Amino acid sequence: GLEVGSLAEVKENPPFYGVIRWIGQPPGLNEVLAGLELEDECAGCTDGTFRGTRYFTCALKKALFVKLKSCRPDSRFASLQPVSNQIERCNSLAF
């Protein structure tokens, strides 16, 4: 479940966290990329460009382009608990 707006984590040491700002397949590449906006600057980050072409705009050195298949829904936020369950939701559907 990865769309523009998704909080994503990149598996690494340490894992990067960011928000997906762009999904697409640049010319020459055989797989779909996500453009992430990171919280902090990174070496090798751009401001929204990939191989010279701009795909979105963010702060300097905060854009990271990664294969979508290498992103996962951010595990930290996936772990937060709703106030109301699906059991309660099912109950609401009936009464």
Binding site: E3, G5, S6, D74, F77, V83, S84, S92
Partner: protein, 74 residues
């Protein structure tokens, strides 16, 4: 309809909202109830960051949904 807003520390508040309310509207309601400035608020639902000019309806946010509030305290 009622939604919940839960801080990362687990403080929970109820809000009365409408599907047509904007995210910016929801942040103003949180400011009014809890005192948190809206420009400090980062609202998360279903693994996505909610952007200011969209509506709750746009994100298909239903009655009794829980939004999570991360503060940009920097």
């Amino acid at each position: 309809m009622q939604i919940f807003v839960k801080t990362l520390t687990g403080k929970t508040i109820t809000l009365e909202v409408e599907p047509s309310d904007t995210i910016e509207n929801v942040k103003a309601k949180i400011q009014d109830k809890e005192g948190i400035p809206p420009d400090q608020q980062r609202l998360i639902f279903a693994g996505k960051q909610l952007e200011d000019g969209r509506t709750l309806s746009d994100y298909n946010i239903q009655k009794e949904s829980t939004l999570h509030l991360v503060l940009r305290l920097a």
